[PDB]
Amino acid sequence: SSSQGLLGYYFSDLNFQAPMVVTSSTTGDLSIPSSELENIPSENQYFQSAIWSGFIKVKKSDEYTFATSADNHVTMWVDDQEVINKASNSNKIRLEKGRLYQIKIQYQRENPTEKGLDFKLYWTDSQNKKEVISSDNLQLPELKQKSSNSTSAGPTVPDRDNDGIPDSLEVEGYTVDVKNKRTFLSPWISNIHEKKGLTKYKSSPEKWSTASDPYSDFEKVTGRIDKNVSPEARHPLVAAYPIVHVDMENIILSKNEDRTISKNTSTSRTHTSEVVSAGFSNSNSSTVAIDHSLSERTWAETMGLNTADTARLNANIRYVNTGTAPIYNVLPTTSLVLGKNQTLATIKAKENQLSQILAPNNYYPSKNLAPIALNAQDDFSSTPITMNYNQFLELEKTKQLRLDTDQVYGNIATYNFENGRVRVDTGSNWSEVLPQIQETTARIIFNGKDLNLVERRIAAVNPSDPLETTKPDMTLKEALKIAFGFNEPNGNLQYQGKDITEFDFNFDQQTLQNIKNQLAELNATNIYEVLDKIKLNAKMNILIRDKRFHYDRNNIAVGADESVVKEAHREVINSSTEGLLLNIDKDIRKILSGYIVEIEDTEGLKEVINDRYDMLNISSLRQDGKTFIDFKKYNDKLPLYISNPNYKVNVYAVTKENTIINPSENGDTSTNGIKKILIFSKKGYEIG
Ligand SMILES: [Ca+2]
Ligand SMILES: [Ca+2]
């Protein structure tokens, strides 16, 4: 436990005013060699005062004499009783086993001749055995949030919220740097720390956790935190909390009786806009699209499902955490919903019986393991998921399901100062924390990574709330850098090489009005030029999306402009009568449902090879990540027959938003009404 010990505050001044280093020491050796002070101006490497705080506990009752390597400069209290005061002494104090004695030490030396501090806390037993106090006998002060209803003995570091960071540092700015076995927390000094690659922190001196999450500002920056918490959420202004949805991977529909439809499904976590404007809702939901492709006639007929029959549904799922904190003992409950509000099933996992962690940016079960079946194989008491005839017709019509997941996440792994360890705390519940996170942060949702919606929350002021006014200012620019890792190599804001102007900015109706007001005040008509001047407030909702795609009402990417789709297919690696091989970006493939292949004769007449709405699925991804478009799949497994070399092979792309998933009113099953985009056209002789 390299984080346990006494907590020390080292000041350059004589009167505990200018804290230069805040760090813990594991043993009674409270020294800081000048060698580990390279992030401190040499001039300020002289410590004229210091304060240490914590507890001492003993594992064998005895009478003890405390001594220090500089008693003449030390005043020391044990449970508010003064035991050393500017003179060495041999007074004994009885220390009882299994008790916690509060320790406080102050040190003052004017104008020391050495940089740093050489200082040790000793004790002597009843056997006259004197030694530097061991790591086993020391523990940190309890830097947890106090109660509403929460003397002296010496100097007090102003620390209104009891996180451990002095009020002045949180307000004016601080940083941390790891030297060997320790993390030194120091005031921000621009002329040293910028070119050392250090991060400048500010936080609220009134909020134990500035993001209102369950990890203290001090715990976050000193690494006294769950290792599974996302690295961006180690910043005191970025909230650390789980965000869980269910991903359905495939589905099997069957008729209930004493022939089946088995289809892959694609599932996306959603964010439902209002009317144009981002939504206010913080609920977890995902929408499932069932593959409409060919396996003949309707599913219902294939299953032999008639008016008085019932259909059964089974599926494989995983839980996905797209948040910034892990989950340990409770997976959230999920409703499987048909249409608007027809609940087909309640999906639950057993409380306190998780087989593994559900970590940020990860899955439950993990990808190397089998997914969860809604009705497991040997689980014969599991409730079947059934639907009547009408309900099944509705399912075949929409081929869509919804998964509404609650926000019940179980207990939190928190740091324990008693033993200097992170452990699951049974008295801490994510439900006791989420509402405050949601109430005190601005939310940004960004899809730049892979077009999936990723949500982050950033501590921001509430100008109506006195406590939330004590927070550091937060610009839109800074939030994007700290929460999402946007950067700016030459002062130009980017996300992973991509210019900021490539992304659209959308807000809820309240946030929009706020932003427009700020723009008018800045005499700006464009948000890009003033991203570093736009201020965020608590409860803003900001949606940021790649401009190259079309989005549905759930803000899922479902298409792109014709030119974007065409350009994406310009890179043909190989063409033959068997198919096309080409490089297609991941993001473009995400918005395509498949392709239509046609042969056009010299007269301009056409033969469509795969002429069914449910025959678009002729594209596959190779191991090397290239896309193969298979001409043979729906051509009776034969290469195209091109009767004359001057005939053309035309291949069209179909985007998700233009995909037809059922025959038309009149029973048309062809591709004739499908809105399609030409992406390849070559003559027989050009193909070879
Ligand atoms: Ca504080
Ligand atoms: Ca704080």
Residue numbers in the entry: 14 to 163, 169 to 276, 287 to 303, 320 to 339, 343 to 735
From the paper:
It is a key component of recombinant Anthrax vaccines, since the immune response against this virulence factor confers protection against B. anthracis infection. Domain 1 (grey) contains two calcium-binding sites and the furin cleavage site required for proteolytic activation of the molecule.
However, recombinantly PA (rPA) stored in aqueous solution is aggregation-prone. TANGO detects several APRs in the amino acid sequence of the protein. It was experimentally demonstrated that the solvent exposed APR (APR1) in domain 3 is the key determinant of rPA aggregation in vitro. Therefore, even though analysis suggests improvements are possible for all three APRs, we focused on APR1 (N573IYTVLD579). The MASS plot identified position Thr576 as a suitable design hot spot, allowing for mutation to Glu, Lys and Arg. An additional in silico mutation screen using FoldX revealed the stability of the T576E mutant could be improved by 1.2 kcal mol−1 by a compensatory mutation S559L. The mutant side chains were well defined in the electron density and superposed well with the predicted side-chain conformations by FoldX, further validating our approach. Moveover, whereas WT shows characteristic signals of aggregation in the plot from 50 °C upwards, the T576E/S559L mutant starts aggregating only at a higher temperature, suggesting we have removed the APR responsible for aggregation during storage at room temperature. This is consistent with our design, in which we reduced the aggregation propensity of the strongest and most exposed APR by the T576E mutation, delaying aggregation until more advanced denaturation when the remaining APRs eventually become solvent exposed and initiate aggregation. Taken together, our data indicate that mutant T576E/S559L displays a lower aggregation propensity than the WT protein, while conservating both structure and biological activity of the PA protein.
